[PDB]
Amino acid sequence: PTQQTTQSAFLATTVITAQCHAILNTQFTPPTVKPDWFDDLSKKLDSAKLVAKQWIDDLGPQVSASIPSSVINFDATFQASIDAIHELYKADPTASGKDNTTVQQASQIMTALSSQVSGIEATVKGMNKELSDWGVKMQAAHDDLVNGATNIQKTIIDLQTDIESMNNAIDNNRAAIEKLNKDLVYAQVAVGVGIFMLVAGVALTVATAGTAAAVSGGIAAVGAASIIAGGVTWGVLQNQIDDDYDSIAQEQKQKAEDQQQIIALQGLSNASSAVVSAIETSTSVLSDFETTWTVFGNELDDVVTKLNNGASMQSIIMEKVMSDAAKNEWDDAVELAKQLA
Amino acid sequence: FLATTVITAQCHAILNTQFTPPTVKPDWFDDLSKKLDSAKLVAKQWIDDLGPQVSASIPSSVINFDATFQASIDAIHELYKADPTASGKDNTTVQQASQIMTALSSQVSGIEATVKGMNKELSDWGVKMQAAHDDLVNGATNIQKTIIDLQTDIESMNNAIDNNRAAIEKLNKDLVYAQVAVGVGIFMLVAGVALTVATAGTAAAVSGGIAAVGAASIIAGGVTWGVLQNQIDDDYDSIAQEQKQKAEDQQQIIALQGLSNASSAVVSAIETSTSVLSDFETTWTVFGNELDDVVTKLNNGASMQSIIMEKVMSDAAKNEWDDAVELA
Amino acid sequence: FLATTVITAQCHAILNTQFTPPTVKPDWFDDLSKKLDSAKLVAKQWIDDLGPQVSASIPSSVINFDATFQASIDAIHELYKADPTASGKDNTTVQQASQIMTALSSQVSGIEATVKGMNKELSDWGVKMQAAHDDLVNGATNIQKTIIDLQTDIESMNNAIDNNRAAIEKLNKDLVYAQVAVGVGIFMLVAGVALTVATAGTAAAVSGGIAAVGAASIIAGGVTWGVLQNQIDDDYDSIAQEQKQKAEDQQQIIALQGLSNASSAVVSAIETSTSVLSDFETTWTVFGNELDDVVTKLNNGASMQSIIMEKVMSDAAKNEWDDAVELA
Amino acid sequence: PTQQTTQSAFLATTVITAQCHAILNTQFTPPTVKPDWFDDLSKKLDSAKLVAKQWIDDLGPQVSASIPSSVINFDATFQASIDAIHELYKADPTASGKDNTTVQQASQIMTALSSQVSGIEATVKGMNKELSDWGVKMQAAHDDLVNGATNIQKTIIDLQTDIESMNNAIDNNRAAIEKLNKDLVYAQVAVGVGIFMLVAGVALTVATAGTAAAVSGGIAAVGAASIIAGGVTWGVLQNQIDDDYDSIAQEQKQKAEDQQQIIALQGLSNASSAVVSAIETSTSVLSDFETTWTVFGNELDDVVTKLNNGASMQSIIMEKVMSDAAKNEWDDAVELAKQLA
């Protein structure tokens, strides 16, 4: 029927009303350290945001004035034309050739019906034009993401090699912390034998009254040197372990920020590409929906002119249009349009 | 599938939750509260201003279409039935129908204006909800920053506890050497004294040297025993303190994971609220153009304007009727 | 050899292989889990949506050609068997033929548009399949990365075990020297102290040097006996620790070989799926062009369109009658 | 015959789509250090994916619109319109000179078959034109890979010499670790002798106290020197062996990465050369398939102008164009083109 181009023209526009929100909700965080690409990819988001602004409060609501509202507006008069002709059937169902006044009255009322459906297709024309030039603005705010300062071709590869760089740094710092543990055990052994050799040296110096003070002073001096070496090595290695874990924290939150950036950029790119790919089908099927009502207006024009020429009132029942067999289909079409709202 | 109850449920969830701090509150937390309560400004400004307006715009369009519109259609219907052969705009009866037609199409213009103003009243509230979503999801990255920072802190405390346990093992194995030092020192001290007494002091230098390394070994092993035992107590206290810090910051991880789950739930709620506002604006501009239709039903013809406009009036009234009672 | 059964079997093979982490859970196994669950999302998006799409496109092409096409061919076969001579555009019989043919060739338009849109609905899925393939391979090279790393870890622990065994043999040789140092030392100590007590009345420090070198020999031999014995026990504990590391690394390498075989089976299934996908697009373009043939059939003549177009519709529809029962 | 060239041109293009899938399978992994040839042969891969991606989405399936669907659309009429003239033979089986409307209609049905066959070979021209531009773009992507910074003539050779470098460095490092094992044995006997003569020298110094104390302090001094020298030699050699096995890890991972890159570049070269050595046969035999329908177009059009001007109705059966054994071959053609599906 004609209902399945109405539902298809409404569905491909509700897809855009949904996915403009997917573009507009995409808003990534300012990082700790700000990269090079961050500013000149932000404005190309805002241009891709503001035109989606023109789909959330201006054109998104207005595309519902086109597809359900013009069909129910046409059927509001198409529920009135049939009874107005069916009442005048009882007066003169034989009057032909533009003779009786009521036949010419019904003729100019169906001419007003043709002007009403011409206004229907004019409303759909205005809505399709306001869809199309916004589509040029949204596509112009889209294709800059794929031509210059691209999110995919440059920054996805850049943030992937940045995530790999931070993973490499994390691996190097963890192997470094392993080696510093293996050196810290040596520092503790050195300060232990330093304690022992220092007290043994000064004890052999005192306990022999300095008769062997050369070798005992040597033992005490190597003990004090081992104390100092183990102590400052322990302090230095613990400072390097703490600074290595601070570096692990820094590049770990850097890798987290880069993952949060790539998911937002992939969402923005996929939403904008699907918005363009569905705006194409939306404009095409709205063009078919506009020409459907335009050729139906021309068909009603041909019926009006052939009714002005010579057509009998029973020849209108010989026609398909003003009977019950088409208004019964379009009652289901407006029931579908009430399902679509 | 009623898209007003969906926004009712989402704003109920947004007005519902109020997230609690962790044990130590960071620098952004109250600011995250300052990115929540502004949303707690709008979700009541929906349900105490625009929630009342969506429950007060429909009794203006069901009651004034129950009494005024039905009789005002019946009047022009009976004016059709009184003379179905009339013509002309300067007719008496066509004038009597045209005054009521222009009056009804002029008094639906005010309710048209308030419905078209309701579009603007929902528009700015929708963009404000979008902005309050984007500021809250802007603040909700510091939670992941502090979570991954405290995860690094947990890894650092695990490394330090492993280091201190290896130090406990090595200091036990060296404390054995300090005890062996005082043992062999006490033995060779009494060996030097007994060898000096037994040889009547003739083995003076040898047993004096044995006793000298004996005393040096007992006081050196004693000081090394005291220092290594004190160090073992110190890094047992360090193991206890770093295990306590690991449990405490792990508790902070669960607290901030609950906070991040709450903030993710609230921003997903506004994420769905934007699509449900899109569908409600779809239905609302359908109703606004339905009343635009009733205003463009001011069109008056020349001959018998009654059946050419008033059945369209009643049919658009019925299309408003079924949808507004679905919104009731 | 049925191409759709091949791809549904391969997608269910992607669904039933999840892979297990090794003992030390690395820093990339969460990323490999992300690559697998994205490939699972692609395989389940094909199984849950495009799967029933292929199985629901065919009864829509059978049922509409069961009765709706056959009533059309029966009607415009009656119009040719009863009146094969009528011509001219305003003729009533060719008007009936053009009415039922602009009914059929424009009621097939939605079904043709669906079957034509499924070409792009397959193409974006093939793009997502080759997308989920390559990041999975870039994650699965890290398998043999750590496999090579644990292989040289095995080599390092084997070299260190051989080093500790050579050190154990040399220390078990040097213990004999420390023990003969204690023996010769206690012999020279008792000889030197006997030599000093036998020379008490005069002086003999020549006798007092033998006992000094004997006492230093027992002290030095005892200290290195203790140190070399504790180093032997330390080297046995090091052989035990390195053999434990070698056993656990050999245990981890076969888990990594299993994970490598899992990622290899998944990428092999994706490759045969992406080839049989092109073999399915091979016939999907055939059915797309076959429903484009009805667009070629919509061009109607003026003079007895039955003998011009209707058996063409019957022959192409019978080719679709072959194909749609070949797809089930 | 008239079907086996269609099957041969289809066997020519399934080879193209299979080796194009072999091109799309080729994606080599990023190494730890990205060499000189990478950053170009990334995009010289990647662009040689994108034009190859044109075969994957549409154009490969669109050359599968040329052969196996046009035979169906051709015997939509050729299995049809032979039996239309068989009922026209019932009225006038010999009437010539354009006297009847039946002969004038059997003429225009053959002109309709002429326009249908011309539309078939025009669809074949469109699909072979798309194959022509895809084939020259595939040659355009093959040229810069196989000539400018050649993957096989340069980087296969440079990677083989890099593998030889890593092999010689691995054997060098394992010889160094064997030498370091022997030097470790010497350092262990150094510290083992040094502890003995240290404590022997200190016990001799504390016992003797003469010039024997001077030579005993010498013994203890060379003992402490041997302890410190053997100890730092032991520690330095364990440090060197651990760093050297980390070097063995680095070189073995580099050798495995290089073997993976060589296998990927061998697969790329085999796939792209098998594409380019078959795409010219694909265009040549699809041009053969187009000129087969062009020969069929003139071989129908001469029958058409003879049937218009001076043919009988038995003479249509007499010619082999409208014959039935050849039409049995042209039902075998449809069964073959459906077997190719």
Residue numbers in the entry:
A (entry chain B), D (entry chain D): 10 to 350
B (entry chain A), C (entry chain C): 19 to 346
Give the exact sentences the study uses for this entry.
Using Caenorhabditis elegans and Danio rerio (zebrafish) as host models for bacterial predatory interactions and infection in aqueous environments, respectively, we obtained evidence for a new V. cholerae cytotoxin denoted MakA (motility-associated killing factor A). Our recent studies of the proteins encoded by the mak genes in V. cholerae demonstrated that MakA can form a tripartite cytolytic complex with MakB and MakE, whereas neither of the three proteins displays cytolytic activity on their own.
We used helical reconstruction to solve the cryo-EM structure of a MakA filament assembled in vitro in the presence of ECLE liposomes at pH 6.5 and high protein concentrations. One repeating element of the right-handed spiral consists of 37 tetramers that complete five turns around the helical axis, spanning a length of 216.5 Å and a diameter of 322 Å. The building blocks of this filament are formed by two MakA dimers that organize into a pinecone-like architecture, spiraling around a central cavity. Interestingly, the annular density is located between the TMHs of MakA, indicating that the active toxin form interacts with lipid vesicles and starts to oligomerize by internalizing membrane lipids. Interestingly, despite certain similarities, all four copies of MakA adopt different conformations within the tetramer, as indicated by MakA-1 to MakA-4.
